[PDB]
Design an enzyme around this catalytic site. Structure first.
Site, short mmCIF file in Angstrom:
data_model
loop_
_atom_site.label_atom_id
_atom_site.label_comp_id
_atom_site.label_asym_id
_atom_site.label_seq_id
_atom_site.Cartn_x
_atom_site.Cartn_y
_atom_site.Cartn_z
N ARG B 231 -3.11 6.69 8.37
CA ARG B 231 -1.86 7.42 8.51
C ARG B 231 -2.00 8.64 9.37
O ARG B 231 -3.00 9.38 9.29
CB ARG B 231 -1.32 7.82 7.16
CG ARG B 231 -0.77 6.67 6.36
CD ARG B 231 0.60 6.31 6.91
NE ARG B 231 1.30 5.29 6.17
CZ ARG B 231 1.23 3.99 6.39
NH1 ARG B 231 0.44 3.50 7.33
NH2 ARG B 231 1.94 3.16 5.64
N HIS B 279 1.65 2.00 15.95
CA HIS B 279 1.54 1.63 14.55
C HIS B 279 1.64 0.10 14.42
O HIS B 279 2.48 -0.42 13.70
CB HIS B 279 2.58 2.40 13.69
CG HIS B 279 2.33 2.34 12.22
ND1 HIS B 279 2.68 3.36 11.34
CD2 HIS B 279 1.71 1.40 11.46
CE1 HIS B 279 2.32 3.04 10.12
NE2 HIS B 279 1.74 1.84 10.16
#
Ligand SMILES: NC(=O)c1ccc[n+]([C@@H]2O[C@H](COP(=O)([O-])OP(=O)(O)OC[C@H]3O[C@@H](n4cnc5c(N)ncnc54)[C@H](OP(=O)(O)O)[C@@H]3O)[C@@H](O)[C@H]2O)c1
Ligand SMILES: NC(=O)c1ccc[n+]([C@@H]2O[C@H](COP(=O)([O-])OP(=O)(O)OC[C@H]3O[C@@H](n4cnc5c(N)ncnc54)[C@H](OP(=O)(O)O)[C@@H]3O)[C@@H](O)[C@H]2O)c1
Ligand SMILES: [Cl-]
Ligand SMILES: [Cl-]
Lengths: 316, 316
Positions: B231, B279
């Site tokens: 993350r 991502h």
């Protein structure tokens, strides 16, 4: 004890570094050193050669074994005066593992659409692309020897579907293989074609437009990819270029070229879906080369047979 | 039979395609469809969510199980009204295998000096670079769960030296691991740092200048590399930038950012030794997601316990 001639056109710092403590008990004659340019080389049994000078075997008429610095011997076989004694090629875990790194990298770059994501980055644009997993792609490897086998097993372990081709058939868990006559069936199943063939008179120009047109168009990208780290003389670059321009090939990775170093005027340098590397898919670890050579000298001198001897008629 | 709410901000064609034949026997309410924007959602037991609208749990007060569309739940835990019922995260062989592809690609890109060779290509310059093998590099993975373990085993099988770190210690053949207090010893051995941690209050900003300065400088490139696919909130981007500029980091691969989508004004887009992906290190295979969800619904309804339930206090 015989000297060892070393005539290797490798990164010179790497050769120099590896010489230290090599061939203990033997004189080592490094022909990179200008001091040795007139030395006579008769009465010497061993030479380790890579892109050696044309007159070498006339200077060293008494060689008993010639050792290539690389796995490939197509150039060494052409050297004037190559003696009629065993020619031993380089085979080693360091070389094999290095080639598998390069092959894995190429298959991942093409799978993961690296160039598309770099083009998006150049536009500062965030965009997720539909993405197949490795199991959605079949990698077909032409050349199933030392390197082709290790690359196939490693690709399969990463999740790729892997198939292989070579003259004769071979047994490899998790990898279906094809013999010479199975070529067309193999190509029709292949999305990413990987070349790990030697250059021989029989592999010259094998990678051409007719062959690229037979590759699978049923894969997740609708067009196949060509990856070659065998020899450049096996490919027809005019056809690779035409196929890339038309979209018959969706991309390529080339570590080897018909003429090396690759001309600075080549179009391959600037092409957005080609990755060019300068014949570095697997560098010879010079230290490991000398350990391999030392080992083979020890076998030869003990009467054991040499390993990895080339079939000079076959060219590999 | 309860309906299933699907509120997934995924590529819409992929969701639509996967819906066909999903959840047989149940009404499927896809909140991507404008037809469903006013439907009341009471009396419905199940929802599958990814970046769902803020008011969702107020519309669906009777949920018995919430299913994340991703492995990571830091965003879902923050959703207003998240009910006090089990939250099940996505864990699946398809997700795992995809992440390992991305991690392997990054480690190879940095190992094989891909950006250096691309810069040479841009100058039409043929030049072989000294090249370590994967065994000369230690990859240290922070985060040793589903994804960290699979990535470590695959890296080791490709020849990398691999070490791992996480809060508690774990037993993995061919991979030495460290617990929380071993962090500094782990970092000092690490040349390529791979982040596969969830974002939790305890991992927030963990990847900073102080941590990058502790990484090994003894590896073949003289400077470490940072690769993050956990993350973005775990990293301090101002520090990554400063470290790259100074050479404290030699390069990075970033799939996740403090604020996503990454701003078009970010410097990361243009930086020669950073690889940016949006991502996508592991895309959710929506078909597999629904199979996982169907499976867990079947267990729940048979009285078997749910698998991959999140500890909401821990954040993962
Ligand atoms: N790019 C680089 O940096 C780099 C580095 C190292 C090597 N290489 C190249 O890679 C090549 C392969 O090395 P290797 O150690 O894997 O060689 P290898 O063990 O001799 O394997 C050669 C394979 O090619 C097959 N083959 C040869 N001629 C064929 C033909 N006409 N039709 C079909 N199959 C044919 C052989 O089949 P059979 O077993 O049936 O004979 C064998 O499977 C080397 O020759 C070298 O040119 C490149
Ligand atoms: N980029 C992408 O596309 C993508 C895709 C999927 C997932 N992800 C991210 O990857 C993460 C990991 O997924 P996963 O399935 O591997 O999770 P997992 O199985 O829960 O593993 C999490 C690991 O992190 C460790 N950990 C958590 N907090 C820690 C702390 N404060 N200090 C040290 N170690 C800590 C855990 O240690 P313990 O076992 O000791 O608790 C565990 O080893 C997800 O949370 C998600 O954010 C990203
Ligand atoms: Cl192209
Ligand atoms: Cl950079």
């Amino acid at each position: 004890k015989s000297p060892v001639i070393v005539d290797l056109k490798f990164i010179p710092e790497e050769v120099e570094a590896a010489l230290a403590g090599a061939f203990p008990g033997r004189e080592v004659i490094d022909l990179a050193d200008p001091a040795h340019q007139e030395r006579d080389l008769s009465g010497i049994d061993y030479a380790v050669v890579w892109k050696s000078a044309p007159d070498l075997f006339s200077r060293a008429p008494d060689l008993k074994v010639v050792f290539s610095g690389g796995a490939g011997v197509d150039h060494v076989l052409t050297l004037p005066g190559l003696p009629d004694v065993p020619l031993v090629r380089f085979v080693d875990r360091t070389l094999t593992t290095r080639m598998s790194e390069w092959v894995m990298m190429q298959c991942l770059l093409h799978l993961r659409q690296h160039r598309a994501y770099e083009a998006l980055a150049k536009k500062h644009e965030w965009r997720d692309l539909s993405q197949p997993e490795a199991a959605d792609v079949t990698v077909g490897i032409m050349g199933m020897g030392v390197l082709g086998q290790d690359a196939a097993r490693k690709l399969a372990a990463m999740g790729f579907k892997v198939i292989g081709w070579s003259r004769s058939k071979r047994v490899i868990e998790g990898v279906e293989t094809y013999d010479a006559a199975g070529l067309d069936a193999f190509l029709g199943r292949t999305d990413f074609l990987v070349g790990l063939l030697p250059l021989t008179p029989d592999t010259r120009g094998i990678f051409n437009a007719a062959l690229f047109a037979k590759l699978s168009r049923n894969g997740p990208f609708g067009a196949p990819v060509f990856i070659n780290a065998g020899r450049g003389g096996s490919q027809v670059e005019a056809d690779i270029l035409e196929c890339l321009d038309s979209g018959v090939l969706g991309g390529a990775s080339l570590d080897v070229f018909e003429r090396e170093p690759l001309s600075p005027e080549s179009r391959f340098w600037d092409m957005p879906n080609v990755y060019v590397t300068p014949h570095v898919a697997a560098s010879s670890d010079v230290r490991a080369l000398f350990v391999h050579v030392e080992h083979q000298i020890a076998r030869f001198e003990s009467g054991l047979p040499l390993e990895h001897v080339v079939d000079k008629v076959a060219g590999y």
